[PDB]
Amino acid sequence: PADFVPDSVSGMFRSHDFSYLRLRPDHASRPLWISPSDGRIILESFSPLAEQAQDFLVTIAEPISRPSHIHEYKITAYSLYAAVSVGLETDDIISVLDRLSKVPVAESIINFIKGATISYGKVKLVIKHNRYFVETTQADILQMLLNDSVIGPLRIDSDHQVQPPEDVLEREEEDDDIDAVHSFEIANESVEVVKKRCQEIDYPVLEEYDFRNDHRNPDLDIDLKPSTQIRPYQEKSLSKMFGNGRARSGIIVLPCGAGKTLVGITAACTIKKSVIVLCTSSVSVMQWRQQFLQWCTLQPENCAVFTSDNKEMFQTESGLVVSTYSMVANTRNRSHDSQKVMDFLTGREWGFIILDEVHVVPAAMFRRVVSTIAAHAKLGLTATLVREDDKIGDLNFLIGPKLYEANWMELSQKGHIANVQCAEVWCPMTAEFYQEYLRETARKRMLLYIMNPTKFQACQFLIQYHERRGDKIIVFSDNVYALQEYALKMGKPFIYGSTPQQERMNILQNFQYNDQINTIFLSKVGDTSIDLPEATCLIQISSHYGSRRQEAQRLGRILRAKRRNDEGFNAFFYSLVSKDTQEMYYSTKRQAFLVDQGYAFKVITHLHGMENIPNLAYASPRERRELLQEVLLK
Amino acid sequence: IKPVFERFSSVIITSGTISPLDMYPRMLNFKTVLQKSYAMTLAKKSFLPMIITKGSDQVAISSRFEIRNDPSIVRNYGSMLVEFAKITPDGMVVFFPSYLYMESIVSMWQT
Amino acid sequence: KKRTAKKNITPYQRGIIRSLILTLDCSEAMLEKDLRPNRHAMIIQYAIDFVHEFFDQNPISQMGIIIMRNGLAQLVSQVSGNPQDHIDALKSIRKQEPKGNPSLQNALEMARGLLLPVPAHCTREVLIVFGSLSTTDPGDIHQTIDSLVSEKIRVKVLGLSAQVAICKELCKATNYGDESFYKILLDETHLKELFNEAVTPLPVNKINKGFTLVKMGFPTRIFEDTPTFCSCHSKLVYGGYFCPNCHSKVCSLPTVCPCCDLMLILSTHLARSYHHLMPLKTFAEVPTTEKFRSEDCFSCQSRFPXXXXXXXXXXXXXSRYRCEDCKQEFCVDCDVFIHEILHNCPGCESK
Ligand SMILES: [Zn+2]
Ligand SMILES: [Zn+2]
Ligand SMILES: [Zn+2]
Ligand SMILES: [Zn+2]
């Protein structure tokens, strides 16, 4: 009942029968070729409507491929909710393109399309006093509201509220379902139980986000200044969630590493009212607020961070909150500096909530944060579209409708991440590495094949290449000694596991401000959670990387955005994986999911000067034997 | 206007702007003979009336909000304007609601 | 539903012996992604085509190239009768990239003095490829406009999908005050035809001017190969020609002699103008029913002409393009290709 039932409609209806089935006669006068029983849409060069089609099909369905002649199609039942977020004339999509589609459309898919598009969309959600209220899109909503018990626990019997409807809206119901019905006021704590039943009772509803109902009458001043940054794909995908001027809190799976904070500081300061920013852990969020926000508009002195151990400005922060999921709602709130924050978070209005890769954490801690605070808007900058808080009542529909998904080629190619490059360098193995492959039989060799120095040699060119090409380098290597075993090799101010900050602050003031230093790195501590810096060249090494949800998080995140079109590949990527290994399957599975979502994946095992670069430290296979007495001990 | 109304009967008033042609008879308290508007007999567009309520931000943009600057509206206007300078040929004019309002937007756009 | 000129007022003086130095823009404007590579690279692709064709349709003319970069104009090719020097120049220019802004007046005067050595018979003309919306002029352009018109040099230019009034005025000003020379593009094929119509000479109505006779001789080919020796380039030539007057061993070239400086031409260039000089009237598409002529093409054998009362298929049209002078038909494919390539109306040729 509480399992994620409605989320996974995408990729369905892939079947057909040659001998038994029949064919739509319209193929001859059929510019397009869409298969509903097969789930794909082959709109090749003969299908010229890809402009509207890509506009409509991307919303309605999933892109199977991106062929030059024409892209491919995926049966997006989830795109049905995505198309549900569009709301255009339904017949035109089925009909206007239907002329191009020579074969007939899928009937069971159409029945599923009816179920997917508007079928799971009309249960009940009334609007009360500039927010959601006690009503329904259908009288069953009111009748179910009449039967509402968990929903009924925290509602004002008045049809709506002015201050309560502003504040209580028993929490923010600004994401309520089909309105224009009599309501009843909603109190100021706990819509969790309101949405508790909807998980188990499955209220299939047509919702929206009444953005201006996030009035948040007291405007807690922010700094809406151009100190923060932005690149064009944001002001498209943001404009997707911004809507027409009136910024709507929508659902945006935002990779941290796509100008994620850039989205917020635009958006948050745009609200110019009391905002809550939130990352994972008190130790983790510290890095998060640090390394972007001050070149950006934010000053640390006001974005207060609590732990119940870090007594900070709660009830006194002249500025908004950047917060830690660990601090906010978890058992280890074993003191009070965190406690009064919620009392203050109840005490103070909050117009914006920022969520970062919360797919890491169960909603048990998360929905705890949302059960009293009584905010006005939230924002889940999701990491992987499949997560552990996206149950039948998904997080994809508590903030607002879908507005951003795995399509960077249309979006990111706006100069924001234009000319997106993904490459999987297949480093040939050597005797000792394969003798190590021969040696042991466990996942500890993950440490004994990540250790490739030719991978450093290839990356060392990328250093010198982007030393000269003027591209920003990111190296994803959670290793520590091997990093230092290579940080000595590569030779730049090194970021290492458990680095004190100011050196990295020097290293990143050598990244945002200086150029004599031309390389940086990421460990299992910076990520997470450092605001990923400027990116035109990415190196990734780990490929087992539990989980794939973390990997699907890892995909868009380790490669940050770049307001760049000058570089022929304004975001280089390099998956330095020694070929003929265990993670070869993992990197190739990554490589598929590299090419699955549109990220322009490639493979270059013949590097431009792989060995021609200097400082080939430890190059000889006997050298590769000399130090191998160390790595096996891991 | 009453004495000039009084002195003569044959009087001609015309405009390409007057709309509606009924306020003025109400305003100046007189009876005309023909209250008719002429339309441009053009087989070609020759002018594109454009109502930019929504900018690139798709923000409902206005001058009624204040006589002051708000970069959300203003910088949007400034960003909106510049693209014309590239595409438009010689000849392009703006018309502020107020000269003081004109100067208000000038300095920060200069900034 | 036909897009044809009502009549062709060719019949007399046109621009035959030409001295054109087309000027390009090499600026950030040409860098932008208006065309698939960009303006410039596709234009360089486009520009390359006309060169040989210009020398093909008008081998009796001379041509150099000038560009405009970073608010300054730069000549990039010498006025010559050989495409290759011009052709090879663009290859570097292809690998070169446009930069900065164009300087119109720099091109105005650099080309202006460039055409000074041109003889009267060689007709001076300039064409412009412009992408920006403003110029870079070290001085009064109207003075230069005055200077050019005083030099009696009509000019056609083609800007991008826009209009510049002074450029509209300039093409007007250059061309006797007649403005028919600031045509601009809206499509690449619509741009391609601009090349296609450019190769044509330019008759409108030439004022009664001093008309000069011309004396020259034909060249005589050299036969020996082992005797390789050249004079116009001081090289060894495994085969050449001989001047009618200076009698110099000259490589294959329809250009002027290098010793006594006289034009060397055999026959080919001459008759190129002739069909240009006196072209034909378009083969009139004879009616579907009012013609009732032979159900076949005349130049070719296209037995199908309509569809014979086939609802709308026959009511569509009748591929019966008939030359009026010969009173003989022609299939559209034949007739268009005839007027396209070889005037030579066989019905008019047969008499
Ligand atoms: Zn020679
Ligand atoms: Zn001679
Ligand atoms: Zn024929
Ligand atoms: Zn004829």
Q: Are A453 and A627 in contact (CB under 8 A)?
A: no
- What's phi and psi for C326, nearest 5 deg? -80, -15
Nearest ligand (C-alpha, residue C300): 3
Alpha-carbon separation of residue C58 from A373, A497, A560, B93, C51 (angstroms): 83, 74, 57, 47, 10
- What's phi and psi for A155, nearest 5 deg? -120, 145
**3-class SS of residue A356:** strand
End-to-end Cα distance, chain C: 34
Chain centroid to Cα C165, Å, comes to 25
Contacts 24+ apart (CB under 8 A), A52-61: A52/A96, A52/A97, A53/A97, A53/A100, A54/A410, A56/A83, A56/A86, A56/A88, A56/A93, A56/A97, A57/A97, A58/A407, A58/A410, A59/A83, A59/A85, A59/A86, A60/A86, A60/A93
Measured between CB atoms, does C33 come within 8 Å of chain B? no
Q: Cβ contact (<8 Å) for B59 and A244?
A: yes
Tell me how far apart the alpha carbons of residues A490 and A291 are, in angstroms, rounded to a whole number: 24
End-to-end Cα distance, chain B: 49
Task: Say which amino acid occupies A27.
Answer: H
Edge-to-edge strand order for the sheet containing A380-381? A355-356, A380-381, A251-252, A402-404
- C-beta neighbour count of A311 within 10 angstroms: 13
**3-class SS of residue A628:** helix
CB within 8 A of A111, min separation 6: which ones? none
Q: Which has the closest alpha carbon to A352: A249, A213, A245?
A: A249
* Chain A partners within 8 Å of B54 (Cβ): 244-245
Tell me how far apart the alpha carbons of residues A124 and A224 are, in angstroms, rounded to a whole number: 37
Q: What is the full DSSP assignment across A139-162?
A: HHHHHHHHT-SSSGGGB-SSS--S
Neighbours of ion ligand 1 (CB under 5 A): C 230, 232-233, 251
Exposure string for A268-284, b = 16+ CB within 10 A, e = fewer: bbbbbbbbbbbbbbbeb
Measure CB to CB from residue B58 to each of A224, A245, A270 and give the nearest one: A245
Q: Are A17 and A35 in contact (CB under 8 A)?
A: no
- C-beta neighbour count of B20 within 10 angstroms: 10
* Chain B partners within 8 Å of A270 (Cβ): 72
Tell me how far apart the alpha carbons of residues C28 and C99 are, in angstroms, rounded to a whole number: 5
Exposure string for C284-319, b = 16+ CB within 10 A, e = fewer: bbbebeebebeeebbbeebeebbeeeeeeeeeeebb
Tell me how far apart the alpha carbons of residues C1 and A293 are, in angstroms, rounded to a whole number: 65
Alpha-carbon separation of residue C47 from A100, C54, C79 (angstroms): 38, 11, 16
Q: Which two tokens stand for residue B27?
A: 């305003």
Output helix, strand, coil percentages for chain C, rounded to the nearest 5: 30, 15, 55
Chain centroid to Cα B53, Å, comes to 14
Counting every residue written for chain C, the total comes to 351
Tokens 């034949």 sit on residue: C334
CB within 8 A of B23, min separation 6: which ones? none
Q: ω before A588 within 30° of 0 (cis)? A: no
CB within 8 A of B29, min separation 6: which ones? none
Q: At what angle do helices A50-60 and A90-100 cross, to 10 degrees?
A: 130
β-strands A355-356, A402-404 pairing: unpaired
CB within 8 A of A252, min separation 6: which ones? A237, A240, A241, A263, A379, A380, A381, A382, A403, A404
Q: Which has the closest alpha carbon to A42: A51, A31, A52?
A: A31
Chain C, window 134-153: residues with a beta carbon less than 8 angstroms from a chain B beta carbon: 134
Q: Are A191 and A173 in contact (CB under 8 A)?
A: yes
* Chain A partners within 8 Å of B79 (Cβ): none
Q: Which two tokens stand for residue A110?
A: 């159409």
- Torsion sign across C-alpha atoms C171, C172, C174, C176: positive
Measured between CB atoms, does A242 come within 8 Å of chain B? yes
Total CB pairs under 8 A between chain A and B: 19
Q: ω before C37 within 30° of 0 (cis)? A: no
Q: Are A378 and A249 in contact (CB under 8 A)?
A: yes
Tell me how far apart the alpha carbons of residues C268 and C211 are, in angstroms, rounded to a whole number: 23
Kind and range of the H or E run holding A625: helix A623-626
Tokens 């990421």 sit on residue: A522
- What's phi and psi for A41, nearest 5 deg? -135, 105
CB within 8 A of C114, min separation 6: which ones? C21, C64, C66, C75, C79
Helices and strands, counts by H and E, chain C? 11, 9
β-strands C18-23, C123-125 pairing: parallel
- Distance from residue A212's CA to the centre of ligand 1 (Å): 82
Helices (H), A383-525: 431-439, 445-449, 453-469, 481-490, 501-509
**3-class SS of residue C55:** helix
Q: Are A127 and A138 in contact (CB under 8 A)?
A: no
Q: Cβ contact (<8 Å) for A244 and B54?
A: yes
Q: Which two tokens stand for residue A556?
A: 């868009």
Alpha-carbon separation of residue A577 from A173, A450, A543, A588 (angstroms): 48, 7, 8, 10
Nearest ligand (C-alpha, residue C332): 3
Q: What is the full DSSP assignment across C184-226?
A: --SSHHHHHHHHHHHTS---S---S--------B--EE---ST
Tell me how far apart the alpha carbons of residues A195 and A176 are, in angstroms, rounded to a whole number: 11
Q: Which has the closest alpha carbon to A363: A398, A322, A339?
A: A398
Q: Cβ contact (<8 Å) for B86 and C133?
A: yes
Method for structure elucidation: cryo-EM
- C-beta neighbour count of C80 within 10 angstroms: 14
Query: What are the binding residues of A for ATP?
Result: 254-261
- Distance from residue C81's CA to the centre of ligand 1 (Å): 14
Tokens 């970073």 sit on residue: C70
CB within 8 A of B87, min separation 6: which ones? C133, C162
Give B106→chain A minimum CA distance, Å: 18
Q: Are A569 and A420 in contact (CB under 8 A)?
A: yes
Helices and strands, counts by H and E, chain B? 4, 0
- What's phi and psi for A537, nearest 5 deg? -145, 120
* Chain B partners within 8 Å of C165 (Cβ): 89-90
Q: ω before A35 within 30° of 0 (cis)? A: no
Which residue of B lies nearest to C165 if distances are taken between CA atoms? B90
* Chain B partners within 8 Å of A244 (Cβ): 54, 58-60
Give B74→chain A minimum CA distance, Å: 13
* Chain B partners within 8 Å of A219 (Cβ): none
- Torsion sign across C-alpha atoms A63, A67, A68, A70: negative
The DSSP bridge partners found for residue C328 are C323
Record the resolution, in angstroms.
Answer: 4.0
Beta strand ranges found along A92-241 (DSSP E): 126-127, 132-133
Tell me how far apart the alpha carbons of residues C299 and C338 are, in angstroms, rounded to a whole number: 9
Angle at the Cα of A49 from the Cα atoms of A47 and A54, rounded to 5 degrees: 105
Helices (H), chain C: 28-31, 39-57, 83-95, 104-114, 141-150, 165-174, 188-198, 268-277, 313-316, 332-340, 346-349
Chain centroid to Cα C95, Å, comes to 25
- What's phi and psi for A258, nearest 5 deg? -140, 30
β-strands A251-252, A402-404 pairing: parallel
Q: ω before A529 within 30° of 0 (cis)? A: yes
Helices and strands, counts by H and E, chain A? 22, 18
Q: Which has the closest alpha carbon to A73: A12, A9, A5?
A: A12
Q: Cβ contact (<8 Å) for B90 and C162?
A: no
Task: Say which amino acid occupies A161.
Answer: Q
Q: Cβ contact (<8 Å) for C164 and B89?
A: yes
Tell me how far apart the alpha carbons of residues A631 and A453 are, in angstroms, rounded to a whole number: 13
Tell me how far apart the alpha carbons of residues A235 and A262 are, in angstroms, rounded to a whole number: 10
Counting every residue written for chain A, the total comes to 634
- C-beta neighbour count of A466 within 10 angstroms: 18
- What's phi and psi for C294, nearest 5 deg? -60, 130
Mutate to test the interface with B, among C133, C134, C160 (most CBs of B within 10 A): C133
